[PDB]
């Protein structure tokens, strides 16, 4: 029997970091960038009018007096695809965002002119560069758009699109395969007969894997002789950083599946000094030693084991810096018993007392265990009783 | 010009609550359940061994060796009858033989295969999961209004429900309009600009909790644009269109939008993002946000008005973002009478754990890069100087 601390050390030390992948930028939302992204295109990609007015050479509208009419030879709107070159002493009507004519260096505001349609007279001077959004004003080639290690949010995705990057290298979510094993199991579209039970765990643990941040594939029930089970597990090893199997621990009924797991890797089935969920296992499969969690058939115990050991492996594989959960001290509302020598993890309801802002916790047979829990009372190994009014550690299930 | 409060009030009241949908239970994770789900069968449907051992009558082991007359594994579908003073080996989960009432654990016996000696007694019912121990008919597995987490998904599977009625995420269509726009896999020619906003606003819609379809660039004459918008109305609770306010470039799309509903383009007393619009399209009055081409302003408008509508469509009551007080690090300018939303970087001072904020508002590259917050400047405040304590909207990732 190992402690919770020793088991957590084993599984976390074995965690496999997924290899970076290059993906379309929209699919990178919430993922950590795995490369430094430099802009290859300027933003804006061309000099633009910053206001409605007339693209000119500043010197032709008094732009160098601080050191009369001009022909209007074109009109440019946003999206214009035709090249336009400004000759000396010429003006081109421009709308905000329009591509500036070549050889212009300023925009005379509409309000600073007589608004002439064929010939325009400047009523006030503009200096060179004024009211122009120059090419590369916001971003130049070589500028760092996204740094390695940054989480890609909506603004970063917008930045990638603004510099013409359609794909980006990211650290992907760890891939998890969830498998249920047992001759008693039937899927939820079937009618269980004598000796048959619905496959609860593949659905609940796949959901817990998604909430933890993994890229989860629910295989469901793996049925057949051990060689067929081995075939199934091997196929999941090709596509997984984490494998979770229920029904592989418990007794003689899983001797065959454990035999096949021993042919695929190093399997450890030493118990953990915890409750519920003392009976569990952990293996490293294949040449890359992929973590394989062996969980029991009990759905409540499996969820507790998943939260205690699988979720931290998911979080570190994601590049997260807080692996564990927040732990708060709360006042017990009801009586709880615990095994002497085993750490207790009691699914509970954590609340704030309106009259004192103090945290209160209520401990919550399958219906009660699978009910609405936002906390787990963490009972030390040597503690055997919790009474109302006792202050206890509560793991907050955010 | 209307205030931020007035515009937020307008869009919130127009939010469309999605109709419930029946979906596969795995796809219901994190959604609110829209129906009461009752168990129809007792769980388990049969007495099963809770451990490896010997199914017996407790009285026969002192609750004297017993002959072992069979072995039952998990998944056995045939009934088996235990005679007096007999034992049958059982695996965990195996159906208990009829007329047995307890399981003697393997470790509490001499492990005999033909005759078994109990080392200590077990009482009636011990190590047995009786029929209906887990769930009884009529038991409420999931209540209407409960959020479906992993445990509730497990409960739905335990009562044999493959599908469940839920309140779905609001469907949002994101559309970009403008003759200058090209998609990001193209090489922009003369006058062409990458379509930034459809990507950034679709991503913001997903983070807000919407079911987002990014239509991308809607191109063509106004009648074709109307055709596109009408198709998006069939599948949306929210529509977001950029490039429909700004100038002459959007005259066509505003014309067809006015044919589909009542469009309001009154400016909002805010900066950035004063230029915007809002309409309700078709007989189902689908909210339609008209956002500008400026990507920073569009993200600010989305955060300020679209995100609350998403959260309102989800039925959430908790405030939008957390607001923390922080010490200003640099100077910020604001117009009197307009609410400021300045993208900023919020940090904690190591020497005192106090919150500090640095305003990032060229500035677009920095503003969209290292930003985790927005300084919220009141209408009557015209300047923030270093050392000022200000409200910072925390943009949690
Ligand atoms: Na204990
Ligand atoms: Na102000």
Numbering used by the authors:
A (entry chain B): 1 to 67, 78 to 374, 383 to 416
B (entry chain A): 1 to 63, 78 to 375, 382 to 417
From the paper:
In this work we have identified Glp, a gephyrin-like repurposed molybdotransferase MoeA enzyme, and its membrane receptor, GlpR, as components of the corynebacterial divisome. Our studies show that Glp and GlpR form a tight complex that is part of the early divisome, where Glp and GlpR directly bind FtsZ and Wag31, respectively, placing the Glp–GlpR complex at the centre of the divisome–elongasome transition.
We crystallized Glp alone and in complex with the 10-residue peptide FtsZCTD. The apo-structure was solved at 2.1 Å resolution and the structure of the complex was solved at 2.7 Å resolution. The structure of Glp is consistent with its annotation as MoeA, the enzyme involved in the synthesis of the molybdenum co-factor (Moco), which is present in all forms of life and is used by molybdoenzymes to mediate essential cellular functions such as energy generation and detoxification reactions, and to support virulence in pathogenic bacteria. However, a pronounced hinge motion around the segments connecting structural domains I and III leads to an open form of the Glp homodimer compared with the closed form of E. coli MoeA. This conformational change, also seen in the absence of ligand, generates the FtsZ-binding site within the central Glp dimer interface, far from the putative Mo-active site. In the phylogeny of these homologues, we identified a monophyletic clade that contains Cglu Glp and whose sequences are distinguished by two conserved proline-rich (pro-rich) regions. These regions correspond to the linkers connecting structural domains I and III, which differ between Glp and E. coli MoeA and are responsible for the hinge motion that generates the FtsZ-binding site in the former.
